[PDB]
Amino acid sequence: WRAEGTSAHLRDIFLGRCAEYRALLSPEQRNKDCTAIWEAFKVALDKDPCSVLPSDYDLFITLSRHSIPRDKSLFWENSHLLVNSFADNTRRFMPLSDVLYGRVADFLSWCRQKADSGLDYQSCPTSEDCENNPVDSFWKRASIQYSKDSSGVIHVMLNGSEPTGAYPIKGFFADYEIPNLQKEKITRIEIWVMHEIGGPNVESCGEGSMKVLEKRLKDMGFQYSCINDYRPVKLLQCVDHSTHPDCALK
Amino acid sequence: WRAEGTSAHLRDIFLGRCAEYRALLSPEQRNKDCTAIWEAFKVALDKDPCSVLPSDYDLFITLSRHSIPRDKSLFWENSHLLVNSFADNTRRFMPLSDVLYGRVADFLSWCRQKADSGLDYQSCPTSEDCENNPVDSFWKRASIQYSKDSSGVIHVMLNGSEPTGAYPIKGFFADYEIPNLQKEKITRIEIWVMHEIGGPNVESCGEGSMKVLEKRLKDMGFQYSCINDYRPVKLLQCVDHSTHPDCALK
Ligand SMILES: O=P([O-])(OC[C@H]1O[C@@H](O)[C@H](O)[C@@H]1O)OP(=O)([O-])OC[C@H]1O[C@@H](n2cnc3c2nc[n+]2cc[nH]c32)[C@H](O)[C@@H]1O
Ligand SMILES: O=P([O-])(OC[C@H]1O[C@@H](O)[C@H](O)[C@@H]1O)OP(=O)([O-])OC[C@H]1O[C@@H](n2cnc3c2nc[n+]2cc[nH]c32)[C@H](O)[C@@H]1O
Ligand SMILES: *[C@@H]1O[C@H](CO)[C@@H](O[C@@H]2O[C@H](CO)[C@@H](O)[C@H](O)[C@H]2NC(C)=O)[C@H](O)[C@H]1NC(C)=O
Ligand SMILES: *[C@@H]1O[C@H](CO)[C@@H](O[C@@H]2O[C@H](CO)[C@@H](O)[C@H](O)[C@H]2NC(C)=O)[C@H](O)[C@H]1NC(C)=O
Ligand SMILES: NC(=O)c1cccnc1
Ligand SMILES: NC(=O)c1cccnc1
Numbered sequence A, B: 001w002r003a004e005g006t007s008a009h010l011r012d013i014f015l016g017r018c019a020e021y022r023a024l025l026s027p028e029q030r031n032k033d034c035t036a037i038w039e040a041f042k043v044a045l046d047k048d049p050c051s052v053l054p055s056d057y058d059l060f061i062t063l064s065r066h067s068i069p070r071d072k073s074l075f076w077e078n079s080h081l082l083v084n085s086f087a088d089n090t091r092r093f094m095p096l097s098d099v100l101y102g103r104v105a106d107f108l109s110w111c112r113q114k115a116d117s118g119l120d121y122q123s124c125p126t127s128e129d130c131e132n133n134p135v136d137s138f139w140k141r142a143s144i145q146y147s148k149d150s151s152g153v154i155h156v157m158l159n160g161s162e163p164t165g166a167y168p169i170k171g172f173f174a175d176y177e178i179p180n181l182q183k184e185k186i187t188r189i190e191i192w193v194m195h196e197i198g199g200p201n202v203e204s205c206g207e208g209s210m211k212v213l214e215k216r217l218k219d220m221g222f223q224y225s226c227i228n229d230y231r232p233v234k235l236l237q238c239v240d241h242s243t244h245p246d247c248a249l250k
Helices: A010-024 A034-045 A054-064 A080-087 A134-148 A172-180 A209-219 A231-238 B010-022 B034-045 B054-064 B080-087 B134-148 B172-180 B209-219 B231-238
Strands: A074-076 A152-159 A186-194 A224-228 B074-076 B152-159 B186-194 B224-228
Touching: A010 A034, A010 B010, A034 A054, A034 A134, A054 A134, A074 A080, A074 A172, A080 A152, A080 A231, A134 A172, A186 A209, A186 A231, A209 A224, A231 B231, B010 B034, B034 B054, B034 B134, B054 B134, B074 B080, B074 B172, B080 B152, B080 B231, B134 B172, B186 B209, B186 B231, B209 B224
Parallel strands: A074 A152, A152 A186, A186 A224, B074 B152, B152 B186, B186 B224
Antiparallel strands: none
């Protein structure tokens, strides 16, 4: 297996994060059973590391699902840490990592041993090793639910400094999120193409892969808009480059 | 009493946070027993809610204590959320909330019932109800250790928009941290007096209580400097006021 092995203390972390998140839920939906959610989740840990399907996580989603505020969804590519920091634990936005079922798995890895009941802490399969591995099937199931339950203005943070372009035509956003958005429930889709401070401008709005994305969204009937280096996010990036000209204040 | 009851799922939250923090420790000190740490913490918990002393947490500290990188300490008053965000989970600085023994308690509340052995989830005592309460004694013990183990350049974030002054002569910083700093291993102390965007300029460096702080630190023999609205932090505040003139980029 060419992927990271199971995360140490997976259970304590999972339950801990689930417990903390409940407070972020409104009383009406605050009644969640972290123990039951964990039990449903670990069903993938009793199966062959290459035989886990997205649907195996149906119960897990059923027990952890909650509503996502209108206009607060944030999709992304190649911008993991910036998305989490900008979202600020649901205070500004609610990316999947800030939704209960995504929150319990952010940064984690897991899989059972090939021929043993115990968890494999050495390594886990990648899509390359085999398509139906625990982690990929989880994020497929999770991104599908996240997308279906989003409404209002859809925000997407892309990395304009990524060498392969801002929009990967193959991946979760393209293959599992875009196809599951509820057109009738969506106002418009707004893209933020972020560039590293001084970093390279590989692609900006309307260039390369961005043209492909723009065309697909528009062909699907979505109202579209793209912003290069959306200011609120640029300011966050600048916190670590305060003396850089791109970050100088008037 | 007058304070909020003990946090729900305290144990799961405690253990999860402990488990996640371990990854943030140097391999040389990553050897931490979260369950044992919890038990040591419980020693102080399972007592009369008005009979807990800082020393009751000695075992808890001993089992969770680890080193703090030189020049990475960040003390503060009246800016809890700004400090946590700026520190960015030990990435920029290591405030007490980003040190193992502080991390497991950040935002939490706890106390055992006055007459029953179970935890009191209804309410907990304040300094007013009684001085020796679980939470206050905890932070006293923790702030002492955090101060004793800090070295190099000392950073302090104060709120210059606080009505009553930037430096509270009665607070944990003044009463439990300043007196425990080890001058021998400290190079200098640097203050950042932050003002709310457009917010009020109650006090800036060299004014009111700030004069009190400067004189006390200099009387103790420390090298001192103060900065109004330290840029990196101002940029972070600006993320939420991108259009405000104080935040306009060059
Ligand atoms: O590997 P990275 O350089 O990031 C940093 C990562 O380096 C890894 O060693 C370490 O685990 C860390 O998370 O780039 P990455 O984009 O591959 O980001 C993949 C990460 O983002 C998390 N994640 C949060 N939201 C989602 C998601 N995963 C899938 N989906 C599909 C729809 N939504 C999501 C997921 O838990 C995964 O870890
Ligand atoms: O009450 P707040 O509006 O905060 C917001 C929170 O007050 C909590 O009751 C409620 O749950 C609320 O979410 O403002 P606050 O400044 O009083 O900050 C007090 C908070 O800072 C945490 N904390 C992190 N570091 C320390 C510390 N507490 C003491 N010390 C002494 C030296 N170092 C520290 C501590 O855990 C406490 O929650
Ligand atoms: C946006 O993409 C760039 C380019 O892929 C990322 O920067 C690279 O990050 C890797 C790993 O941290 C480094 O090894 C490279 O040297 C970086 N390249 C450059 C040109 O800086 C950047 O981290 C991405 N931004 C976000 C928020 O994820
Ligand atoms: C710095 O101090 C100011 C003033 O005490 C804080 O602002 C107040 O915050 C409370 C609680 O959020 C509000 O109800 C008041 O309306 C605010 N007043 C003003 C004048 O802003 C501010 O939050 C503090 N800064 C930080 C980072 O904690
Ligand atoms: N934000 C995403 O769509 C995503 C997909 C795959 C891995 N990490 C993040
Ligand atoms: N950082 C501190 O000194 C402090 C003091 C009292 C309450 N919260 C934080």
